[PDB]
Amino acid sequence: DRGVSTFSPEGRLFQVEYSLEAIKLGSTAIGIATKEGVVLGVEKRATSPLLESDSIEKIVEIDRHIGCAMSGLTADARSMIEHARTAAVTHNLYYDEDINVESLTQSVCDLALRFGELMSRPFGVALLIAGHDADDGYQLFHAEPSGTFYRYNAKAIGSGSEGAQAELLNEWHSSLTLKEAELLVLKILKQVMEEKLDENNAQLSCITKQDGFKIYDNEKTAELIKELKEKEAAE
Amino acid sequence: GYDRHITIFSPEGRLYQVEYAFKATNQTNINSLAVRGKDCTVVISQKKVPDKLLDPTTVSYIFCISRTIGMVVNGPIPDARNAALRAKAEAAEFRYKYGYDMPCDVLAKRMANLSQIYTQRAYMRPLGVILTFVSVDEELGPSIYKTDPAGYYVGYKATATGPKQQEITTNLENHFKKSKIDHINEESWEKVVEFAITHMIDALGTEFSKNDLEVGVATKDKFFTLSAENIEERLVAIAEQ
Amino acid sequence: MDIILGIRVQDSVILASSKAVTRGISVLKDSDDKTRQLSPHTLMSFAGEAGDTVQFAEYIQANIQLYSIREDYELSPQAVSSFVRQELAKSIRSRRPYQVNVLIGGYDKKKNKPELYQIDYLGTKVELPYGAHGYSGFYTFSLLDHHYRPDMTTEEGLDLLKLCVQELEKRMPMDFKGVIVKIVDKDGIRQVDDF
Amino acid sequence: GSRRYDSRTTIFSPEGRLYQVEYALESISHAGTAIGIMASDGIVLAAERKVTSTLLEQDTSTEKLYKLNDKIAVAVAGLTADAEILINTARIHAQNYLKTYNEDIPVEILVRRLSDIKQGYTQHGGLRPFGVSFIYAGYDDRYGYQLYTSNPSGNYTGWKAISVGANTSAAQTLLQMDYKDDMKVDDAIELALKTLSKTTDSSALTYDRLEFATIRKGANDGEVYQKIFKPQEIKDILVKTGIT
Amino acid sequence: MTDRYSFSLTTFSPSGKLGQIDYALTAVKQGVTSLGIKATNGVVIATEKKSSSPLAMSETLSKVSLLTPDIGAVYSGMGPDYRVLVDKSRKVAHTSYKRIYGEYPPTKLLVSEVAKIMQEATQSGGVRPFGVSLLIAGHDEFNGFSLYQVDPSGSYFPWKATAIGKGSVAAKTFLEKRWNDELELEDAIHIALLTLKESVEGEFNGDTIELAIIGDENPDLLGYTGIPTDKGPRFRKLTSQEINDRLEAL
Amino acid sequence: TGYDLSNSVFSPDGRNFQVEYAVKAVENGTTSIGIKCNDGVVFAVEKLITSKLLVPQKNVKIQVVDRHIGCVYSGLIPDGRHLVNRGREEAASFKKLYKTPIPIPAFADRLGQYVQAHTLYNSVRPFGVSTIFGGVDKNGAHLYMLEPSGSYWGYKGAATGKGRQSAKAELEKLVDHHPEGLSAREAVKQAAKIIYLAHEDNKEKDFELEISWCSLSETNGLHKFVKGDLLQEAIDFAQKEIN
Amino acid sequence: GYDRALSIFSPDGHIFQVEYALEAVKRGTCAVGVKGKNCVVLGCERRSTLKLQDTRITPSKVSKIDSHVVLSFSGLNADSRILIEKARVEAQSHRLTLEDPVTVEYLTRYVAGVQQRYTQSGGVRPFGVSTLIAGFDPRDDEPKLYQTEPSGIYSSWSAQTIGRNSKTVREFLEKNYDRKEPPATVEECVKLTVRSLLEVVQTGAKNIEITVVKPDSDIVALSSEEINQYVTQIEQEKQE
Amino acid sequence: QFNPYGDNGGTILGIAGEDFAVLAGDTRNITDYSINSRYEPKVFDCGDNIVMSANGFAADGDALVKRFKNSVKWYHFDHNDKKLSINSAARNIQHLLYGKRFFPYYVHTII
Amino acid sequence: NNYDGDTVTFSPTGRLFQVEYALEAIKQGSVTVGLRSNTHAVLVALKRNADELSSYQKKIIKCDEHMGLSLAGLAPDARVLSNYLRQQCNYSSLVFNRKLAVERAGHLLCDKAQKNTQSYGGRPYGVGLLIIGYDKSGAHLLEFQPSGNVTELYGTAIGARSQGAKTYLERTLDTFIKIDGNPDELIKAGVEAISQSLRDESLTVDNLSIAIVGKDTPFTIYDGEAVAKYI
Ligand SMILES: [Cl-]
Ligand SMILES: [Mg+2]
């Protein structure tokens, strides 16, 4: 065989590149950042109709001001979330304040490359970390198993990502309202999803300064789905 | 065929890394010889200094392990010096723990046991050296004990090691058939050194200058190496007879 | 903590334990239950150093409950007592020992016999017809030497116990705020609410 | 580095099997047969010694049958040295339990722990598994007489009659034919010997190639006795059933 | 750095063979013949002293080794592996027995400890098996005289008489014809010398043969007097002269 | 085969191919020399000027150990630095316990045993440097050269790197022409010449000369760098000899 | 310690050791979980190539983790014991610190976390086991059924099956189980579970095990005759 | 027996206004009945408009101030040059002090 | 080929392929330029983005008040090495009340990178660094490579198409070295240098990243509208 921390001839880590292929097989997750808030949405993708879809937890709270959506080998994300939650609460204990979104992301990304021959392999999951702080305002971050993170105005990850990212390129502007962003995530999710989009196989969430991180109810999302379909038929 | 890379058994019950370590022994192309007198033990080895830029005083394969024990190595110098440093440490520790000087045969056994471990444990390679230990032991008298990369060791009436070892061995065998005894029946160590050089000359068929040889001598309560002039004095004595 | 008593009769084991929890010059509580159910037919009462008592009792409780789930079987009172003794015997040579004395009352379902074990903080185990820890024994043992009979009923055992509590309330210096009484028999563990 | 030489003893095949466990079972299938038969009033353990030499000391020998405590014994099939490591661990585990609870260890608990040790060697540590299968014969006051087996996978199961080692397929078919639930110890002794006599790779079954043991309640009143049979006692029981 | 070989180097092949054990047994086959014979009042163990060179002093190399005062050992196969096993066997007889019970272990239990050490080299990380088979002869009060063989796997078997190494197949056949249950110790030494002559090719005398017995107690070899219960070692190595005396009436 | 894929494996010859492969990395590196003299030693090295953008005099390759030992090496520069760092620890623990500064032969064996240790296991790589070093102790001047195998000897003159054969030939002439001895100030000038002559085997990029020395009379038994007037004097001597 | 990364990514983004552990689950005997209106039922296959067994003492397929939660599995039997033991220990540890028994979701999440840890820890292979975890939360009457697998993913199921020929029985359950109206009684839930196993099993003799879990630590295992009555009833209705 | 603590004397004083704050301290440093220095400052600017003094045993006082100054530096590195608020500084100093709960810094701290 | 499985293996020609593959990761990285005069030292870095929706990856990191670097290659490895440099700078301040010399900083990075190239299991660092600083001997610029090789220079560049900027600085050497007591002009020369490595793209306001340290100037980084002056 061959080493876990080996470089390829092109100058990339084999295991990191292979984990990126696992993330492409994962279900779609989209995030959009505005001046009124950051929206996070995911494809649930139940493997069978008997599976109770509300138990699929692919959007997750880290703190009141920071939320998280995932894509790939979602079991691997559990220890990453646990670390993020502990980092957020621990900082609040040491400094009597909320922790910066960027600093939280950086702490999660420090786990990523702690593998070799520490854990035996990289994580097989990508994260969209969305939040708000007083300094830099509403923020969206994409955290990879390479240990790298980019800030984004909008970002898609998972199986329909390259198609959804091209769509987000055209649609995003700096004056988007929160309501506009909610519909835009639902619109783009419906395009790239295999099965037909509804309240049971897709989930929305957001983070605002005032109300913090909130996962939307199936009743609330259903009305936004209905509002979206009417607006597309209206022209 | 990874059974030839590490010290595990081959299908025919062999350890190839041990066998190849034996071949590393002759990489220096040097022949050594050891013989016992009545009161002494003499060891001699060829000294080859090919490079003109070398300081010839630093080129040596004979080592003073303790005050009483001497050691000559057949093999590459890095492994020789590794073995020498360990033997020195072992001999010193023995004296501290047990209150008397480590015997030649006991040190030989200890180094042989260490060599054995490298043939059984995978992460450690064998040393590519043959170690010939000499002394005048306070219980056993004049002593020659030799160790190899297999972890084998035994006492010797006399011995030889190197590429042309077999020629030297038979030369010595024939002498002890004739003399009917276990040693060189000689009073002074000077004449035992003369015997050793004389029989090496006959077996190898080459003549030696003072800088072509290296000599170690063990007596009661000390082992010492001879200088170029001490050897030259010895070569003159052989020539005038 | 202070007063814990035990009486083994014909068909049951009765444990009586004081209700007071005192710290300094203040009785902080007067309704404290100084016992834990280890298994359906085994009860352990405890007394000693503050904190240690409950921490030890609950630790034993967790281990016996774990055994019960694993084997789908209840350990005998003799087996539970031997386990408890060993834990205390380990503890006494630790950095900080558990300073806890216990009584283990149980009904062995295989033998159809009640059993009472007295174990001190050193790991000193004895099976007894009646037992007590602390200063209580200095009154109750001689009283029970006189009035106890091996063939008594549970009702006779409760009257015998009332006689002990009355003597302790008369001659003990401290107000221990009465006792909680529990009975261990073939049908399990139950609490006497009016004592 | 060392990665090059790692056999990877604790991995799955593409089919979902454990290579080393399967190959250890293949090793055990060439070992001398061992039979266990459980009766209503006792248990028999019988085992065939691996191709005996005439100069082997027979009376002061122990290959197949080992005592774990006063109430539990095992029959071995596989590498004897591997078995002795596990037996000494089992002997210690039994005494730890007795020290803790002041009661003799229940048979299943001892079996589970020994099987859990074997399991560990298949999931972690990078070491080869133990090339051993055990037949456990024992008694406790909960379940009475019990027969179990364990194998290199660390999986264990309970039996009324069972064989391990060589020719188990043939042996199990003969046991399944003649076994019944109301059977006595003396009948089970006869069945054990008859089964070995037919499944043996030798020409004829003799006293010097056999180890035999019973666990009866044939002591005096409500107590269990272990009888590891002597050579002369095997010779007599072989004549008594009419095999020689 | 550090021992990165934490995995087994002996594993099961598809056929169920343990390759490294089989190959260790092959190394034992190539080794020089050694044997053991049990008598009614003693045990004899013997082997040829294969000299590496005639300049070598074969007295300094001891193939037959004392383990305890009443237990001895001989081998066939790789000599260095044997030497370290004798060191470990002597030490384990003290650490796991004499320092606990104040007396030497019985033969069977010391054998069991040696077997354990050899089994561990078959399963532990980063090691090969020992390339030797041992014959261990001994006496103890409650078991009397005994003789055991120990193989590279860690397996051991008791023997009335046996041989291991080069010409073991022929030597075992020879012993079967001569061995009976009424043999006296002197008769067993005689047979041991006859058996060993078949496998030896060159010189056959007290200087090329190494032979030891487990027999009567030797008070003269104890080194002190005054304790009646201490009567001396039962292990005795026969001298070069003592062997040659028995070779005349052969 | 496959005997060359792992360090510490003997080939059927009795050779460690991985050590021989480390020697190739040494042969690839720049030229460095050592000259033993009357009462001390002189070290010199070729520094290839890759670009105009390299700051002159500010990429120092010769290293000091303790206060009396100089070390220079050819091959993988970081491996050399790792060896010197060890040497400094070895020299410090010697002085700590025994008070006296480490003798040069003693120091040589400390490096020798450490390099040799990196040929014993497959979990480490051999050193990709040959190291020329030495100084002045109680017994006088000593010069040593240490190789990837752990092999070292004492030398009258030493050379390693791409221009080793040219430098060795030039060194052999000095040993023959000066049997009574060479002086410290002479050896500095000769060192400059030999580096300039050895530069003919690496002549695409022009170079920068760097010299150091230990001498009982000239530097008081301490290691110093040759700078300023004494350096320019040695450069001019070397420039005159090539033409 | 043995450090080797056994579970690693391949070029196509798969962890083969985890996927091969799923194959071991596919080889294992079938296990089914069906949750009703006021109950959960766990059904398990037992292969009939083993006669001369002692069913008194043989390890049962359904294991109690606490008095209110049960765990069945499919895959390697020896591996399952290690997960069951850890779960039982965590159940008692939760009672000790929180003064409340575990929820079914919490116990599942713990077992799933253990399985996940063995997919990115050095020197270990994944568990060749998938579990069905069923029960009722403390002081709650809503039935809970969860599934775990070697990768570490877990989720809740109205009904689910695992093991050999599980795709056949999952097909059966997908059309026969109504979300709007689950099995209203214990009898209805057991029957649907037995029916689903009868698609795959062979004979309904000593091949099917049924365990019924009800609220407030009310767990009972059905005997041969009790199960055989369901088998006899289903076959007579089938002939139509 | 060796006593790891000492008393270096002096005194400090902090007052808060509406849009300002003062932290004052005398410059005398003593041991027993001797003056060590007439001018040895113990009120320090720690950056981010925070002033600090740790009066009592001066070795512990200097150690604590040094550690807090260093804490401010790493707060900038780890949180994108963010200004450390006075309330956050206060909590950080609690953890510094309580870290040595069983071998305390013998000092009275004011920021 | 057969000798690139790990960093512990030499090739038959004496090469370490894992180190060379790590070196290759730097060439794929975005361009960054370093240059200095006698009074000041300047870093200029072309930042890279994933797409138009993403932010531009920050290339420059501060190590102390008088020292910092720019990176090219694996950014997490730069974070590890910069964190180590922060600690070593900080150790020098707390223990010795001494600002760490820029030369010692380079020596410490060299030795840290080396240990990863000689031991089994580990891997080389996959990043190149340009360290600038002002210490007791004036302005300094260093180039770090993950082979371990550290080099002091007047100017340099690393990353993709760095040869264009490196050639320009080789021509401009005599001019920019004497820009003393003038920060803006030394930056202008650095901005003109990095422009020689541009293809199709040009320097925009959120693309360019500049840093400076000097005699009476702490290490400070300029991004966003602060660099609009130099476009
Ligand atoms: Cl030893
Ligand atoms: Mg007591």
Half-sphere exposure of I134 (CA within 13 A, CB side): 20
Q: Which residue has the tokens 């030799």?
A: B146
Q: Which residue range forms the structural domain that includes residue D169?
A: 1-244
Closest CA of chain E from D81, distance in Å: 5
CB A193 within 8 A of CB A28: yes
- D127 with E124: Cβ contact below 8 A: yes
The Cα A169–Cα A25 span in angstroms is 22
CATH code of residue C44: 3.60.20.10
Length, in residues, of chain F: 243
DSSP-assigned letters across all residues of chain I: --S-S-TT---TTS--HHHHHHHHHHHHSPPEEEEE-SSEEEEEEE--BSSTTBPBPP-EEEEETTEEEEEEE-HHHHHHHHHHHHHHHHHHHHHHS-PPPHHHHHHHHHHHHHHHHHBSS-----EEEEEEEEETTEEEEEEE-TTS-EEEBSEEEESTTHHHHHHHHHHHHHHHTT--S-HHHHHHHHHHHHGGG-SS----TTTEEEEEEETTEEEEEE-GGGGGGG-
In chain A, residues with a C-beta closer than 8 Å to the C-beta of D5 are none
Quote the radius of gyration of chain H (alpha carbons, Å): 15
Residue-wise over B135-147: b if at least 16 C-beta within 10 A, else e? bbbeeebbbbbbb
Longest dimension (CA), chain F: 57
Q: Ligand 1 centre and the CA of B108: distance in Å?
A: 10
Number of neighbours of residue D157 by Cβ within 10 angstroms = 19
Closest CA of chain I from A146, distance in Å: 8
CATH code of residue G75: 3.60.20.10
The Cα D63–Cα A162 span in angstroms is 68
The Cα I122–Cα A118 span in angstroms is 12
Q: Ligand 1 centre and the CA of B64: distance in Å?
A: 21
Q: Which residue range forms the structural domain that includes residue E202?
A: 1-250
* Token pair in block for residue E125: 């990380």
The closest alpha carbon to E115, from D83, D54, D67, belongs to D83
Query: How many domains, chain C?
Result: 1
CATH code of residue B150: 3.60.20.10
3-class secondary-structure state, position A17: helix
CB B185 within 8 A of CB B35: no
Which residue of chain F has the CA closest to E4?
Answer: F123
In chain G, residues with a C-beta closer than 8 Å to the C-beta of A144 are none
Considering only the beta carbons, identify the residue of D26, D127, D131 that sits closest to E15.
Answer: D26
Which residue of chain F has the CA closest to E1?
Answer: F123
- Please provide residue B98's backbone torsions phi and psi, each rounded to the nearest 5 degrees: -110, -5
Tell me the Ramachandran region of residue E101: left when phi exceeds 0, alpha when psi lies from -120 to 50, beta otherwise. Answer: alpha
| Strand ranges across the sheet with G218-221 | G159-162, G31-35, G40-45, G208-214, G218-221
Provide residues of F within 8 Å CB-CB of chain I: 4-7, 18, 21-28, 51-55, 58-59, 76-79, 81-82, 85, 118, 122-126, 128
What are the structural domains of chain F? 1-243 (3.60.20.10)
- Are A and B neighbours with ≥3 CB pairs closer than 8 A? no
The Cα B44–Cα A224 span in angstroms is 98
Closest CA of chain H from A134, distance in Å: 11
Q: Which residue has the tokens 């020395």?
A: F213
Closest CA of chain F from D4, distance in Å: 10
Considering only the beta carbons, identify the residue of F53, F58, F78 that sits closest to I173.
Answer: F53
In chain F, residues with a C-beta closer than 8 Å to the C-beta of I2 are 5
Closest CA of chain C from D141, distance in Å: 10
Residue B187: which residues within 8 A CB-CB, separation 6 or more?
B38, B39
The dotted CATH code for A1-235 is 3.60.20.10
CATH code of residue I154: 3.60.20.10
Q: How far is CA C46 from CA C133, D57, I7, in A?
A: 9, 60, 63
- Are D and H neighbours with ≥3 CB pairs closer than 8 A? no
3-class secondary-structure state, position C191: strand
Kindly report the three-state secondary structure assignment for every residue of B87-110: HHHHHHHHHHHHCCCCCHHHHHHH
Which residue of chain I has the CA closest to H81?
Answer: I62
Half-sphere exposure of G103 (CA within 13 A, CB side): 10
Question: From the DSSP assignment, how many helices (H) and strands (E) are in chain G?
Answer: 6, 10
**I8 in reach of chain D (CB within 8 A):** yes
- Please provide residue C20's backbone torsions phi and psi, each rounded to the nearest 5 degrees: -80, 140
Does F31 qualify as catalytic in the annotation?
no
Closest CA of chain G from A80, distance in Å: 12
Query: How many domains, chain B?
Result: 1
The Cα G64–Cα C73 span in angstroms is 12
Q: Which residue range forms the structural domain that includes residue B178?
A: 1-241
Provide residues of A within 8 Å CB-CB of chain D: 1-3, 117
Q: Which of D12, D21, D112, D191 to mutate to test the interface with G (most CBs of G within 10 A)?
A: D12
Q: How far is CA F103 from CA C7, F34, F107, in A?
A: 85, 18, 6
**E125 in reach of chain G (CB within 8 A):** yes
| Strand ranges across the sheet with D144-150 | D65-67, D72-78, D132-140, D144-150, D156-159
Neighbours of chain F (3+ CB pairs under 8 A): B, D, E, I
Residue E178: which residues within 8 A CB-CB, separation 6 or more?
E191, E194, E195
* Token pair in block for residue B220: 């009661």
The Cα G102–Cα G96 span in angstroms is 11
The Cα E104–Cα E100 span in angstroms is 10
**Structure determination technique employed:** X-ray
In chain H, residues with a C-beta closer than 8 Å to the C-beta of A97 are 85, 87-88
Query: How many domains, chain D?
Result: 1
Ligand nearest C132 Cα, by number?
2
Provide residues of H within 8 Å CB-CB of chain A: 78-80, 82, 85, 87-88, 90-92, 95
In chain I, residues with a C-beta closer than 8 Å to the C-beta of H73 are 90
CB B96 within 8 A of CB F193: no
* Token pair in block for residue H87: 């309330």
CB F125 within 8 A of CB I148: no
The Cα A226–Cα E205 span in angstroms is 108
Q: Which residue range forms the structural domain that includes residue I229?
A: 1-231
Q: Which residue range forms the structural domain that includes residue C103?
A: 1-195
* Token pair in block for residue C93: 């040579």
Query: How many domains, chain I?
Result: 1
Q: Which of D10, D11, D13, D23 to mutate to test the interface with E (most CBs of E within 10 A)?
A: D23
The closest alpha carbon to F79, from I16, I89, A27, D123, belongs to I16
The interaxial angle of helices G77-98 and D107-123, nearest 10 deg, is: 110
- I10 with F18: Cβ contact below 8 A: yes
Give Cα E123 to chain centroid, integer Å. Answer: 24
Residue G220: which residues within 8 A CB-CB, separation 6 or more?
G211, G212
Resolution for the entry shown, Å? 2.5
The closest alpha carbon to F126, from F231, F236, F4, F32, belongs to F4
3-class secondary-structure state, position F47: strand
Strands (E) in chain F, as ranges, are 32-37, 40-48, 63-65, 69-75, 129-137, 140-146, 152-154, 157-160, 207-215, 223-225
3-class secondary-structure state, position C55: helix
Which residue of chain E has the CA closest to G2?
Answer: E6
Neighbours of chain C (3+ CB pairs under 8 A): D, G
Question: From the DSSP assignment, how many helices (H) and strands (E) are in chain D?
Answer: 6, 10
* Token pair in block for residue D104: 């003799």
Q: Write the residues followed by a gap in chain E (C–N more than 2.5 A).
A: none
- D63 with E157: Cβ contact below 8 A: yes
Q: How far is CA I83 from CA A104, H76, I90, I107, in A?
A: 17, 13, 10, 15
DSSP-assigned letters across all residues of A176-199: --HHHHHHHHHHHHHHH-SSPP-T
The interaxial angle of helices I102-118 and F77-98, nearest 10 deg, is: 100
In chain I, residues with a C-beta closer than 8 Å to the C-beta of F122 are 8, 120
**Identified catalytic residue from F30, F31, F119, F160:** F30
Residue-wise over G157-166: b if at least 16 C-beta within 10 A, else e? bbbbbbbbbb
The Cα E73–Cα E71 span in angstroms is 7
Residue I79: which residues within 8 A CB-CB, separation 6 or more?
A147, I61
Residue C75: which residues within 8 A CB-CB, separation 6 or more?
C39, C42, C64, C67, C68, C83, D101
Kindly report the three-state secondary structure assignment for every residue of E151-188: CCCCCEEEECEEEECCCHHHHHHHHHHHCCCCCCHHHH
Instruction: Tell me the residue type at E190.
Output: H
Neighbours of chain A (3+ CB pairs under 8 A): D, G, H, I
CATH code of residue D90: 3.60.20.10
- Are D and F neighbours with ≥3 CB pairs closer than 8 A? yes
Number of neighbours of residue I85 by Cβ within 10 angstroms = 25
Number of neighbours of residue I113 by Cβ within 10 angstroms = 25
